[PDB]
Amino acid sequence: SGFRKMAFPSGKVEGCMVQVTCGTTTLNGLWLDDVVYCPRHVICTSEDMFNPNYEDLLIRKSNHNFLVQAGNVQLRVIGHSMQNCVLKLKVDTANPKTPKYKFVRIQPGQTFSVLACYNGSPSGVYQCAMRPNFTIKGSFLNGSCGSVGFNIDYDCVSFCYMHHMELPTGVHAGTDLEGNFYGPFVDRQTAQAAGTDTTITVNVLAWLYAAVINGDRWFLNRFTTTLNDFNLVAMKYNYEPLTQDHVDILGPLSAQTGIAVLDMCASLKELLQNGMNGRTILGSALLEDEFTPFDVVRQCS
Amino acid sequence: SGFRKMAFPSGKVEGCMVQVTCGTTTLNGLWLDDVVYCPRHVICTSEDMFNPNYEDLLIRKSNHNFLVQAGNVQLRVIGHSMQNCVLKLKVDTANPKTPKYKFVRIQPGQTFSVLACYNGSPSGVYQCAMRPNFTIKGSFLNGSCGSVGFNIDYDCVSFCYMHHMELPTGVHAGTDLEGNFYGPFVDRQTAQAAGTDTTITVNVLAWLYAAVINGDRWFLNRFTTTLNDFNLVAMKYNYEPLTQDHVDILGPLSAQTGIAVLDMCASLKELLQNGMNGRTILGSALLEDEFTPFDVVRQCSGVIFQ
């Protein structure tokens, strides 16, 4: 029993965190085999941050300019290649603590753990959700650039995110492990607009199934609705339209509780129109959407 | 920028997690040096749990009856003892991944990170707080007994909690790493219940300091209430009694935000009576009491303009 926001054990990822130093700019790096992945703006100083020419800034840099440090040991760079917004640095040692990794790009609505690092040392770990506008409700202080987002499938660490820049609107922009940014963001410290943040419909429906499993069920009603009728209300409260693919994902959650997918939608519809009237679901008065259907299965099986 | 509930990196604790099997029972063990610590009920059957006599039951058990697995590798048991509700199993190999450690007994209200484990394998990590009634609102299932709670004091892992059982309300109870339970609980299959839970005062205060730092300040007001005046309102809405030493802990946050400790209490008093009216603080309709001032300082950093 109990429903908690849970991060994946960060241990495997911890053995990959190094401190990358280029002149005055120092950030975090991901040491996988003999390659150190870090945001390309490590070559840039507090000067270039407004409008930097990355392709021209790399020209005035050599292997001796980069100072990769694996804790106490000072690794030596033997090659530099800038792919998209990430800088790949080849080193002498092919990391002994390398886990069975893979690089994937997470879709909006999906979740991952973030291991926050400061000066190459892991600080903490928390669970994040990629918002539909491609932003993350995170916590990044000065020196967290290079921190990675990941998922764990038994022994395989799937890397999906790397922190690059702090959004002025409080939010946080970053790239996948191949250097491609999420959303309409670039690695320049300029006024960037995040956009409109819609509530993930399928993640709230998955969270409602977890409340039923935990005994909390004061929100259950006799009403029932169809896909087209429920979607009308979704476009009024900033919610995503539920497709047939979303219903197929909510399979094991519907079979475990017993409540049908179309019947649960009516319980959600009444809580948005009327409200919660001071009562709480799973220890919270707000509809939580940072929990994918796979996150609910992982914790209730 | 930003403010999230954050667990400690669990890496150093994952290297100590083992699977402990005694007869039919399987739970988690904490392998520190050449000793494995686990809940002593692993030696009981479901039948023994109705009225266990752990001393006599441990007399009938020997080293061969304890299968300790460090993943797929097996550790030979060369000794067994009992210290309160924890079973200590001596093994033929010291753990190479043993970090700097100490056993501490946290007070209620304090926080720690939990590494939930199933059959010796870590599944996830979350940030917990010891509730006033000595229970924790965690997320444990069958196979989680022996999952540990900890804090990381820069290089030293302070182990403070071991999971033993779950109560009828879905809340969890456990011991410290010395075997002493937290609360009036016992490792016995009998009727037990958590009791009356209250809201942590010093923790809700610190959370309001963190919201001011992160922009949110619509809940602030020109009111100013005294130490004993606020304590009268606190016992009405189920809150902890605020002491002078509790206010001294809120010192760096008061000096950083420039909001006196009694001024934040006055703003909190209005939030208890009037409410939030739908408007949220840090994206939360309820007041959060799982963040101690120490966790807020650690995340918000801050500068005191002396």
Author numbering:
A (entry chain B): 1 to 301
B (entry chain A): 1 to 306
Published text:
Severe acute respiratory syndrome coronavirus 2 (SARS-CoV-2) encodes a main protease (Mpro, nsp5, 3CLpro) that is essential for virus replication. The essential function in coronavirus replication, together with the absence of closely related homologs in humans, identifies Mpro as an attractive antiviral drug target. The SARS-CoV-2 Mpro inhibitor, nirmatrelvir, was found and developed as the oral COVID-19 treatment Paxlovid (nirmatrelvir/ritonavir).
The T21I+T304I and the L50F+T304I double-mutant Mpro apo crystal structures showed that the enzyme C terminus was bound at the catalytic site, presumably preventing nirmatrelvir from binding. (B) (1 and 2) X-ray structure of T304I/L50F double-mutant apo Mpro enzyme electron density of at the catalytic site. L50F and T304I are labeled in purple. The T304I mutation alone reduced nirmatrelvir susceptibility by 3.4-fold, while addition of T21I, L50F, or T135I each slightly further reduced nirmatrelvir sensitivity, resulting in 3.8- to 7.9-fold reduced susceptibilities.
